[PDB]
């Protein structure tokens, strides 16, 4: 856990697990992700926490899409953290999910502008 995820506070485990399992079966070429801003990161907050993303989507393209979504400058820093490790920009969401998904069948990603976060 790269963060204290608000999503986990607001949804009980078995509801999460049942949903993540169902979604993995229904959409085998996508992976269910929870994306939350690090709490003290002074950057834009996303409106939604819960996403279903292409398994072949790279981290680098996700960064680009987030920049476009929240108007985070091309020149400013943006990092993902999965279990406190920053994935390479070439990593895919499917690769990260396979290695790091939780027991509720979701992958949890924190984002921040701070390289040394956590």
């Amino acid at each position: 856990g790269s963060m204290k995820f608000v999503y986990k506070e607001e949804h009980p485990f078995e509801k999460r697990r049942s949903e993540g399992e169902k979604i993995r079966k229904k959409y085998p070429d996508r992976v269910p992700v929870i994306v939350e801003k690090a709490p003290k990161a002074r950057i834009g907050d996303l409106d939604k926490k819960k996403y279903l993303v292409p398994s072949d989507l790279t981290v680098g393209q996700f960064y680009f899409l987030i920049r476009k979504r929240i108007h985070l400058r091309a020149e400013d820093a943006l990092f993902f953290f999965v279990n406190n490790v920053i994935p390479p920009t070439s990593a895919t969401m499917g690769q990260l999910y396979q290695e790091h998904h939780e027991e509720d069948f979701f992958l949890y990603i924190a984002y921040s502008d701070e390289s040394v976060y956590g």
Binding site: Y27, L52, V53, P54, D56, T58, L65, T92
Partner: peptide
């Protein structure tokens, strides 16, 4: 990777 948009990330 193929080109994706924000809408490709939507919870269904």
């Amino acid at each position: 990777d193929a080109t994706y948009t924000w809408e490709h990330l939507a919870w269904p």
